[PDB]
Every structure is written in C-alpha cells, then in structure tokens.
Amino acid sequence: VAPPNLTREQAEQRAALLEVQSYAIELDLSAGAGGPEVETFGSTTTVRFRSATPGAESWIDLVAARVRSAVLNGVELDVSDYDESTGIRLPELAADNELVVHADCQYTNTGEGLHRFIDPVDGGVYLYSQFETADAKRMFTCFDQPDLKATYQITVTAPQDWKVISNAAGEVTDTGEGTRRHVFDTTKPMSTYLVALVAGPYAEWRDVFPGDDGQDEIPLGIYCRASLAEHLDAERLFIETKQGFGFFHKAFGVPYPFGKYDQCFVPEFNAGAMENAGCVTFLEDYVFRSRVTGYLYERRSETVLHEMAHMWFGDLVTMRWWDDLWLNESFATWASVLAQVGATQYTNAWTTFASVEKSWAYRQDQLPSTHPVAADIPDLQAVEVNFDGITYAKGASVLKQLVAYVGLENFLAGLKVYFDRHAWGNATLDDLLVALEEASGRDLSWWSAQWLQTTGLNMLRPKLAIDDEGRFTSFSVLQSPARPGAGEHRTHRLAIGIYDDDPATGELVRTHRVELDVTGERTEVPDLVGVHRGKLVLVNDDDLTYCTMRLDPQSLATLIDRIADIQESLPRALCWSTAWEMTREAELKARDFVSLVLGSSPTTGIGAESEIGVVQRVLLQTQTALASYADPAWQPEGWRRFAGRLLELARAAEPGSDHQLAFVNSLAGSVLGEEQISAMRGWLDGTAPLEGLTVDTDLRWGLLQALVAHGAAGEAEIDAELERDQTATGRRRAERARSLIPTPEAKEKAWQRAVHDDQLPNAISDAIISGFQHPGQRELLASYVRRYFDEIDEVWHRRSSRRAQPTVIGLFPSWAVDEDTVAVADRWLEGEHAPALRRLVSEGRAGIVRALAAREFDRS
Ligand SMILES: [Zn+2]
C-alpha cells in the first residue's frame, strides 16, 4: 500500500467539480529537535472549497500515520478505514465547504514530504519539504493536483532555536514553553506542490534587491546548515540573484510575483534545486567546501536562474496537468541561459548549452521511450520518470529555435500576453501557442505540430560543388527525416558558417554567414554561390536549431586534423559535439574520438581547449567511448593511452589552474596503471605533490576513491579518512569508497545494502549505488547481470518511484555490453511489469544495443 497514483481522468473529475479557496495549515513541530526516534509531527488542515454539485462525493488526499479527526461542514467523518492510498472520502458535499483534519504525519529520510536530518557535527536538526510531484499530501491534507490552486496560511510551532522559512514572510512569537510560533502571511494563490517549509538552526544571510522600474524591493535571504556556513559564498550568490531579478522583469514585462525571495541549501536533497514560490531549495553540493572549477560556478548560476525563472514559468502560471510540465521546465531552462548571457559574467553559456545540455537532449530523444516535448501523461507514475532530457533540454532547444524563427521581440511580447492572461492560474500547450500567435501575428499550429508534438532529430548536412578556384557553384542544406519518429522534415531557422585560415594567426575564423529558413528535403542557399568554401562549413552555425549536424568530407577532415585551431568557442564546441554524436551513432570510430580528444602536442586535442566546461564534458565522453564503444580487444590499450596522456596533461598544466584540477579529476575516474596510481598516492599523502594542486577535503576523497577502486587502498584507509572528515558529507564519500572495494565480498555487501536497506537515508543509499560501478571492475560486476533483472520488480514494488529510480537506473548492467545481456532484457520484457519500470529497463537495453553497434564500428 502506497500513496495514490492519481490519473489524468481522476484529476479532471475533481477539477470539474471543485474550486479551492484556501488552506490554513497548523504544524506542531515542537518535538522535532528530539532524537532519531521522533517519527511524527502534528498536521492540522482547514480547507475551504466549493462544489459545483451539492450532494456529490469527492475525496481529498493525505499520507499520514494516523487521522485523529476529520470533520466536513461540522460533521464528523468516519476515518476508521483510512489508509494513505485512498485519502479521505468527502460525501454529501455542499455548495460551500469547510473541512478540518487533525493528523500525525511522518517525517521522512527519503527527500519526499517533510524530510528530517540530524547533523552529526553539532546535533542540529534540519527539516525541508519537497512536494513536486505529489508529495504535498505527506505534510497536509490537500487536493494534490496542480490545477486546484489556493492560498495557504501556514503556522508552525517549532523548537525555539530553529529558524523557519516558508513561501511568505511571517511573524514569530515566543510560546513561553521553549518553542516559537511562526505565523506566515497568507500566500498568493499557487499549486500544492509549491508550498514550502524549511526549519532548523540554519545560518542566515540577508540582502535586498532595490525597487526598480515598477518592480518593488525584494527582500533576499540565503540559508544553509550552521556546520557549512564558513564555506558559503553569500556575496557572490546575492550578486547573481540580483542580476537575475533585474533581467527577468525587463524581459517578461512582469515583476517578480511573490513578495520576498529566500534560497535554502538543504541536506540530503534528491535533485539540483526546487522552485517553491519564495523559498527555493538547493542541493548542498552547491555549497563549495572544497575548490571547484569555473564550470561548477557556471552550472550553479544556471540553477539559480532556472529556479528564479520558474517564479514565472511554473509558479505564476502552472501547467494544467503534468502532460504540460514542459511549460515549466523547457521555458525555465531556456530562460536561465538567456539570463546568464544577458545579465551575468557567464556570457559563454550558449556554448555550454550546446556541449552539455544538448547532448542530454539527443540521448533522450533517441531512446525507445522517446516522446514529444508536449507529452502524454496518463497518471502520476508516468510523470515521475518524465523529468528527463526531453522535458528539459530538448524543450529548451526547441524554444531557442522558436525564438530564432519568430524573433526574440515577438517571443517576449508573447510571454507578456501569456503571463498577463494566465496569472494565478493554469495553462496548456494551446494557451501558450495562442499567446505567441497573438503577439507575432502568425499561425503557429503547423509549427507546434512538427516541433512540439513529434519525436526525433533531423540530420542536416551541406551538399556542395566547387569550381577550380574553390568557390561554390551550388550549395544546399539536405534534411533527413525525423528519427526516431514519424519521418517528417521540419522548418528550421538556421545559419551556415564558412571558416578559413586567418592569415595573421593561422586559426580558423568565420569568413561568411548566411541565415535562412530551411524546409523539406533540400533547400538551396543561393547567396553562397560564388563564395570560397574555406576549410570548414557548419550548417547549424550559432546553434540556432535542434538537429543532428553533419559535415561534408573536406570539412570533416578539417575538424579531425585542426579542431583546436577553431578560434571561437561556440563553433569549436559544436565540432566537439559533432564528433561525439558521430561516435554514439556509429559514424566515427571510438578510437578516432579518443585520438581526437587526446591530441599529440600542447596545441592539439582537449588539453588545448580553453573552455573548462567543454574540457570536463569531453573527458567524460571519452571515458564512455573507452568503456562502452571501443572494440573490447582495444579497450586496455585505449585506457593506457588515456591514463598516460591525462597524467602528462596534469603535470604540464598551469599550477593551481582549473585545467590542472580537471585533468586530475578525470584521472580519478579512469582505469589506471601503476604509474598513475603511484603518482596519485603521492599527491594524496603529499609526499610527492603536484605543484599547485591543493588536495583539500573533497579532492582527498576523490583520489582515495580511485586508489580503493584499484586495490591500492582499503577499508582501513577509508576509515582513517572518515576520521579526518567526520561530517555527513564524509560519511557519504566513505560509502562511495566502500562500494568501490574490488572484491566479491564488498560488492555483495554494497548490492545488498543498496537494494534492501530502507533505513538508510536517500543520500547514503544513493552514495552506495554511486560507487558500485567502475570501468576497471567489469569482471566483478558481471556477477550481477541476472541479479538485476531478477530483483528489480521487487525494488519497484517496495520503494516509491522517486526512490527506486536510483537502483533501477544505477544498477542496470550497462557494463555488460553483449548480445547475452540484450537476450536477458528481451526475456524480461516479455513478462508483466509496471509501465514506468518497463520504460527504464528498455532505456538500459537500448544503451547496450547502441554500444554493440559502436563496438562493431570501431573493430579494425
Ligand atoms: Zn526546473
């Protein structure tokens, strides 16, 4: 028995019948600062709502340990058969209704509902809420669906040393008995999944965004655990926050809709961040206790602006049902990057987007599970696995392209129409399209039909002919049918770039750029006729569209021979992305990808790449190419080449630089030989340092984990390290290290605990899974292929979707690239399984099929 799996039709039935005005929520957290045995908190809800049909029956949702009382219009309801799957039935409704429910809800350690964590350092007890998708019902009684918006008035009694943060500002008074009562202002209307509670002895920083241009002042707060406060770069975070608030109200024509804005770094968080209105929560990894590269700063800033963007895209206007989640996530992702480029130091963020996030979109779109951006979601279980590379990155890429197509001025004017119309309410795909059509004066139905309602990618490549002076005599862009999918040819607004040698530096620079609408199978580009072809043609120059870009033969030979010579970072990153995707798609051999990346000198390959985020991403891709895509006979040689070159690059890198750190961190994830192991041990212990590399708390763990993985360190060294870092983060990092121990005994202990131990908190179970795989340990892991398929149904049955996913995705035998693994998956697929589980298993199988084709391609 479990919380409900609300269906689309059930949601529609409640929305047709009900209209909710208000919730008043009273939480008794007075016992919350007690020990690990404290199980429940008091939850009292008063909900005021209308029924269109007096006399009808409905139901409201609640996941609680006990319902003490439930009283509808003053009539006591029989809750003797309450269970969390059925909520509370509501018979004989009146036109106007008031329901009051007193219940004991449960704290979790799963990152769902009201999560409770105890800090081992100082004994501080920290709570935070996480309600998206449908976990609001674990804190208060509610119609837990996004189209029944209401106002919330939250009052909390808490241990007196706790701060309490919610959606709105509040007033606090002493109770006289060791607690404080926090009475929050009534919120603006919002969906249940956006209600927030963060409570504990969090460290606090305050600032203010001054009132500007019709937007009132915004009080700003930052919160984190007291034991982490010395590491929080508050000044930098407030600067980035205020840059966002200046940008978005100008862009959208709509001031920040909530009164204040708090950002809380919370323990044991499951995602990157969550856009609770006025009270955004973040993964603690973004509090940098150790030194990180510039890419992590950039990705944190992206996340900050993503969540700020949702204040409009999701919080002000919300999808009507989960099939339109993309209205929240695609738009927030697009707007985050638009803001980075427009308002922050991260003016390169479209390069990062092309390299990192688009690669996620491609992979997602090519799985057998591929779905349109505007998805079909029959129930909550279907959405729980749909926060994916299509809902986020493909959607964002399609929107970037829609901007290119209609123009930014028209697109922003359309957003203003949309926000003004649907403010404090819900919207669909149709509503968004109508707003955009109104602002642009264009029909976009056909556009939506081919771009938002379809799956797959179109390949785009130049077809050209040149005269004896190298000038084009003809030029067209060929478009392939959309795959995987329906095979349609789309309209793309794209640019073609021609690149040739700059006489002064010898680097490849853009000589010509032609932008046009490409349609159908072939589109001539007559303005390129007569132009010298140069050395490199890019038909998605400036990355305007969503496609599979490919090159003509001369251009591809230039990429292979001279990628580092590309002057500008964006077209160079598009070239790195092309090479990678060709590898994934069995068009470039893995060994050829590895050779491109490794280079052969200081000015060739990835060691010459200036953009740190591209360096990190390309290195991770190379490690995938080696383990998954290279001919098994060549893998050992490929790893020796990689490890040897990365040690050279690390030793050659500028002391203290981000490049130096990236190379070391890449070595720490690789299959290593004795020469690299011994170097790494000397860095860790400091008896033979790498000049300028500061081995700080988290780099010590990263190097020790690599040593453990290779059998060069063991449990005693892990235990000794945990003594040096006696923190909750240390416990997690020690768990990853213990899963990496390369023995059968160790691997079985790790499997048993990951799969079966439901007492461990989310973050620990996940850290255990995160050390299970390693590219040097394939032979140990081969003992788990049948184990996985034979045991995953029972995991899925026992854990929530959100808590089973790490096991399903993370223990899938992606290491076992063999037709035998495909046959085992095939037999599993012939059985009966939950649809969302089947989806995830098929995705893993598809990974194996893609790797087999790549391996055959690399074979020489
Ligand atoms: Zn988001």
Contact (Cβ atoms closer than 8 angstroms) between residue 194 and residue 276: yes
Contact (Cβ atoms closer than 8 angstroms) between residue 686 and residue 695: yes
SS3 content of the chain, % helix, strand, coil (to 5): 45, 20, 35
2-38 burial string, b = 16+ CB within 10 Å, else e? Answer: ebbbbebeebeebbebbebebbbbbbbbbebbeeeee
Q: How far is CA 530 from CA 231, 255, 327, 535, 551, in A?
A: 59, 50, 44, 15, 20
3-state secondary structure labels for all residues of 477-500: EEECCCECCCCCCCCEEEEEEEEE
CA atoms within 13 A on the CB side of 752: 6
CA triplet 136, 139, 144: central angle to 5 degrees?
A: 30
d(CA 505, CA 830): 61
Q: Tell me the pairing of strands 197-200 and 163-166.
A: antiparallel
Contact (Cβ atoms closer than 8 angstroms) between residue 613 and residue 355: yes
The Å distance, Cα 112 to ligand 1 centre, comes to: 17
Contact (Cβ atoms closer than 8 angstroms) between residue 192 and residue 15: no
Among 214, 222, 221, 223, which residue's Cα sits nearest to residue 256?
Answer: 214
d(CA 166, CA 195): 8
Q: Which helix (H) or strand (E) holds 28?
A: strand 18-28
d(CA 746, CA 133): 35
Sole residue written with tokens 């049902």: 321
AA identity, residue 725: D
d(CA 746, CA 245): 50
DSSP-derived secondary structure for 637-692 = HHHHHHHHHHHHHHHHSPTT-HHHHHHHHHHHTS---HHHHHHHHHHHHSSSPPTT
The Å distance, Cα 310 to ligand 1 centre, comes to: 7
Among 220, 150, 214, 131, which residue's Cα sits nearest to residue 188?
Answer: 150
Q: How far is CA 542 from CA 5, 18, 506, 513, 538, in A?
A: 43, 49, 22, 10, 9
d(CA 576, CA 355): 8
Does residue 29 sit in helix, strand or coil?
A: coil
The Å distance, Cα 387 to ligand 1 centre, comes to: 9
- Residue 306 in marked binding region: yes
Backbone angles phi, psi at 210, to 5 degrees: -65, 150
Q: How far is CA 125 from CA 200, 225, 425, in A?
A: 6, 9, 36
d(CA 300, CA 520): 40
The Å distance, Cα 130 to ligand 1 centre, comes to: 13
d(CA 699, CA 444): 51
Q: How far is CA 461 from CA 157, 241, 517, 521, 557, in A?
A: 64, 41, 14, 11, 15
Q: How far is CA 634 from CA 560, 628, 859, in A?
A: 21, 11, 8
C-beta atoms surrounding 610 within 10 Å: 11
DSSP-derived secondary structure for 518-551 = E-SSEEE-GGGTTSB--SEEEEEETT-S-SEE--
Sole residue written with tokens 């030979």: 557
The Å distance, Cα 116 to ligand 1 centre, comes to: 23
Q: Is the dihedral of CA 793, 799, 803, 806 positive or negative?
A: negative
Burial label, 335 (beta-carbon count in 10 A; 0-12, 13-18, 19+): buried
Cis previous bond, 210, omega within 30: no
Does residue 32 sit in helix, strand or coil?
A: coil
Q: Which helix (H) or strand (E) holds 460?
A: strand 459-466
CA triplet 219, 221, 225: central angle to 5 degrees?
A: 170
Does residue 135 sit in helix, strand or coil?
A: coil
Contact (Cβ atoms closer than 8 angstroms) between residue 160 and residue 174: yes
712-733 burial string, b = 16+ CB within 10 Å, else e? Answer: bbbeeebeebbeebebbbbbbb
AA identity, residue 417: V
Q: Which residues pair with 261 in a beta bridge?
A: 220
Q: How far is CA 37 from CA 116, 117, 120, 176, 732, in A?
A: 11, 12, 15, 26, 21
Backbone angles phi, psi at 353, to 5 degrees: -60, -45
DSSP-derived secondary structure for 237-278 = HHHHHHHHHHHHHHHHS---SSS-EEEEEESS-SSSEE--TT
Contact (Cβ atoms closer than 8 angstroms) between residue 76 and residue 764: no
3-state secondary structure labels for all residues of 49-80: EEECCCCCCEEEECCCCEEEEEEECCEECCCC
C-beta atoms surrounding 525 within 10 Å: 20
The Å distance, Cα 340 to ligand 1 centre, comes to: 16
Q: Report long-range pairs for 91-95 (Cβ below 8 Å, ≥24 apart).
A: 91/57, 92/55, 92/57, 93/17, 93/51, 93/53, 93/54, 93/55, 93/56, 93/57, 93/58, 94/51, 94/54, 95/50, 95/51, 95/54
Sole residue written with tokens 């404290």: 38
DSSP state at residue 95: S
The Å distance, Cα 274 to ligand 1 centre, comes to: 7
Sole residue written with tokens 């609408």: 517
The Å distance, Cα 400 to ligand 1 centre, comes to: 16
d(CA 699, CA 634): 31
The Å distance, Cα 367 to ligand 1 centre, comes to: 22
Backbone angles phi, psi at 495, to 5 degrees: -120, 145
Q: How far is CA 564 from CA 509, 561, 593, 598, 623, in A?
A: 12, 9, 14, 12, 20
Among 461, 381, 206, which residue's Cα sits nearest to residue 799?
Answer: 381
Which residues make Cβ contacts (< 8 Å) with residue 11, sequence separation at least 6? 145, 147, 321
- Residue 240 in marked binding region: no
3-state secondary structure labels for all residues of 299-356: HHHHHHHHHHHHCCECCCEEECCHHHCHHHHHHHHHHHHHHHHHHCCCCCHHHHHHHH
Token pair in block for residue 440: 């642009």
C-beta atoms surrounding 519 within 10 Å: 13
Token pair in block for residue 15: 């929305």
d(CA 96, CA 48): 8
- Residue 275 in marked binding region: yes
Q: What is the dihedral of CA 749, 753, 756, 758, to 10 degrees?
A: 160
273's torsion region: left (phi>0), alpha (psi -120 to 50) or beta? beta
The Å distance, Cα 9 to ligand 1 centre, comes to: 25
Fold annotation for 317-451: Neutral Protease; domain 2 (1.10.390)
Q: How far is CA 515 from CA 477, 527, 577, in A?
A: 12, 10, 21
Backbone angles phi, psi at 325, to 5 degrees: -55, -35
402's torsion region: left (phi>0), alpha (psi -120 to 50) or beta? alpha
The Å distance, Cα 399 to ligand 1 centre, comes to: 15
Contact (Cβ atoms closer than 8 angstroms) between residue 771 and residue 740: yes
Rounded to the nearest 10 degrees, the angle between the axes of helix 395-406 and helix 429-440 is 20
d(CA 661, CA 276): 35
The Å distance, Cα 56 to ligand 1 centre, comes to: 37
- Residue 833 in marked binding region: no
Length of the chain: 860
CA triplet 393, 396, 400: central angle to 5 degrees?
A: 140
DSSP state at residue 442: -
d(CA 433, CA 452): 11
The Å distance, Cα 392 to ligand 1 centre, comes to: 8
CA atoms within 13 A on the CB side of 848: 21
Q: Which helix (H) or strand (E) holds 298?
A: helix 294-310
Q: How far is CA 102 from CA 62, 346, 354, 597, 838, in A?
A: 11, 49, 51, 62, 39
The Å distance, Cα 257 to ligand 1 centre, comes to: 17
The Å distance, Cα 275 to ligand 1 centre, comes to: 7
Multiple choice CATH, 202-298, 1.10.357.10, 3.40.50.970, 1.10.150.20, 3.30.2010.30: 3.30.2010.30
C-beta atoms surrounding 772 within 10 Å: 22
The Å distance, Cα 492 to ligand 1 centre, comes to: 26
The Å distance, Cα 314 to ligand 1 centre, comes to: 9
The beta-strand segments (E) located in 91-178 are 96-106, 113-118, 125-130, 151-159, 163-166, 170-174
Contact (Cβ atoms closer than 8 angstroms) between residue 416 and residue 254: yes
d(CA 114, CA 127): 7
Burial label, 800 (beta-carbon count in 10 A; 0-12, 13-18, 19+): middle
Which residues make Cβ contacts (< 8 Å) with residue 158, sequence separation at least 6? 29, 30, 32, 164, 179, 180, 182, 199
d(CA 654, CA 652): 7
Among 782, 805, 804, 796, which residue's Cα sits nearest to residue 828?
Answer: 796
d(CA 31, CA 157): 10
DSSP state at residue 210: P
d(CA 613, CA 594): 18
Domain 1-200 has CATH 2.60.40.1730: yes
DSSP state at residue 187: P
C-beta atoms surrounding 180 within 10 Å: 18
Rounded to the nearest 10 degrees, the angle between the axes of helix 801-810 and helix 835-858 is 20
DSSP state at residue 813: -
Q: Is the dihedral of CA 682, 687, 690, 695 positive or negative?
A: positive
Q: Which helix (H) or strand (E) holds 295?
A: helix 294-310
DSSP-derived secondary structure for 13-24 = HHHHHEEEEEEE
DSSP state at residue 503: T
Backbone angles phi, psi at 252, to 5 degrees: -95, -20
Burial label, 285 (beta-carbon count in 10 A; 0-12, 13-18, 19+): middle
Token pair in block for residue 796: 């899925």
DSSP state at residue 587: S
Contact (Cβ atoms closer than 8 angstroms) between residue 131 and residue 192: yes
The Å distance, Cα 420 to ligand 1 centre, comes to: 21
Contact (Cβ atoms closer than 8 angstroms) between residue 321 and residue 540: no
Contact (Cβ atoms closer than 8 angstroms) between residue 772 and residue 787: no
CA atoms within 13 A on the CB side of 830: 6
The Å distance, Cα 301 to ligand 1 centre, comes to: 13
Backbone angles phi, psi at 774, to 5 degrees: -160, 140
Q: Which residues pair with 165 in a beta bridge?
A: 198
Which residues make Cβ contacts (< 8 Å) with residue 73, sequence separation at least 6? 94, 97, 98, 99
User: Chain centroid to CA 787: how far?
Assistant: 29
- What amino acid positions are annotated as catalytic residues? 307
Contact (Cβ atoms closer than 8 angstroms) between residue 321 and residue 146: yes
Contact (Cβ atoms closer than 8 angstroms) between residue 506 and residue 558: no
The Å distance, Cα 409 to ligand 1 centre, comes to: 24
Backbone angles phi, psi at 483, to 5 degrees: -145, 140
Contact (Cβ atoms closer than 8 angstroms) between residue 547 and residue 365: no
Does residue 159 sit in helix, strand or coil?
A: strand
Q: What is the dihedral of CA 397, 402, 404, 407, to 10 degrees?
A: -140
Helices vs strands, H then E, count in the chain: 28, 28
d(CA 493, CA 491): 7
- Rg (alpha carbons) of the chain, rounded to whole number: 28
Contact (Cβ atoms closer than 8 angstroms) between residue 783 and residue 747: yes
Q: Where are the alpha helices (DSSP H) in 394-484?
A: 395-406, 408-422, 429-440, 445-451
Name the experimental technique. X-ray
